Design a protein that fits this description.
4-stranded mixed β-sheet, about 110 residues, chemoattractant activity (chains A, B, C), binds the ligand CC(=O)C[C@H](O)CC(=N)c1ccc(O)c(F)c1, binds chloride ion, 7 strands, two-stranded antiparallel ribbon, isomerase (chains A, B, C), secreted (chains A, B, C), cytoplasm (chains A, B, C), homotrimer, cytokine (chains A, B, C)
């Protein structure tokens, strides 16, 4: 899976261990081995949410399977919890787009997963 | 909705009030309340369009509904208009990707919109 | 088409002409004229792949058609090859998301391709 967070919080406010924490927590949540999980955090962004620029985050989670109505509701709680505690972002200022991808449309290691 | 603009134009050329202009204009265009609109502007990017590094922009608008043939033409006119007027980017050097998302695939505040 | 590469490799490690090579090679691979290829390279990112912060990349290729099983394998070989040779990123630390988009959902020049 691939998890991306874009945020206006400054780089200094993103803990050094945040990417590893996200990796491990997403591995548990998706049931995928952590070696497969990629994480990308983009701080210092020029953003607004609801016309205001208090801390906020725009995220996406991409996976081959393990995406669906109930699962996504559960991922939102996991990810809002982490963003709230580690980045101090209110959960009502977080959007997460979920993508359930076909293996044929995910490239890796000179090929695709298909 | 969520609107993202990636451009090679320098930060200094992004007018103050641009995020608010995008928020309000998108509210009127989509008919969605401004409190749900998220906007993200990323200047100073390393990009090319047609091989040329003259000003360009790569955008994306994500929405639950309010996306379609007719609506997208209207959004493109509005958004290229703003990028031309405010950022001095030629409309033929702008791409906008439109995403009509299922409510179940959009996380917000510890749940999804489904 | 639109190709985006996000990487933790430093900017100084992206060779001069990389955006031109991507434009040219993607035009050849997709069969699309190079005038309509947009490329976006984002170095110096805060990223992890499998919990390691060694060089990695997360990419996407969006196209109206020219996306499918066999084609995507070919694009992945091409693109992972370039990331390995030019940016020194191991192919097993690259993900590429492929998106086959409807013309009605791609804005350009004040309109859409629909
Ligand atoms: C199950 C595995 O061995 C590898 C994973 O399936 C890769 C994966 N789920 C994956 C990686 C990047 C993506 O962007 C994505 F949508 C899915
Ligand atoms: C008025 C509402 O019910 C909330 C909005 O409809 C949410 C929305 N359309 C929305 C927000 C962020 C997204 O990334 C997205 F794809 C859709
Ligand atoms: C006449 C053409 O060949 C136009 C191209 O098909 C544009 C194209 N495939 C394209 C451009 C930007 C995009 O973001 C995208 F998803 C697709
Ligand atoms: Cl720390
Ligand atoms: Cl589910
Ligand atoms: Cl897919
Ligand atoms: Cl969706
Ligand atoms: Cl194919
Ligand atoms: Cl589409």
């Amino acid at each position: 899976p691939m998890f991306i967070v874009n945020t206006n919080v400054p780089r200094a406010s993103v803990p050094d261990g945040f990417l590893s924490e996200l990796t491990q927590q997403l591995a548990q949540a998706t049931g995928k081995p952590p070696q497969y999980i990629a994480v990308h955090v983009v701080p210092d962004q020029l953003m607004a949410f609801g016309g205001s620029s208090e801390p906020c985050a725009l995220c996406s989670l991409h996976s081959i399977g393990k995406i669906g109505g109930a699962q996504n509701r559960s991922y939102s709680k996991l990810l809002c919890g982490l963003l709230a505690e580690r980045l101090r972002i209110s959960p009502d200022r977080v959007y997460i787009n979920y993508y359930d991808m076909n293996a044929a449309n995910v490239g890796w290691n000179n090929s695709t997963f298909a």
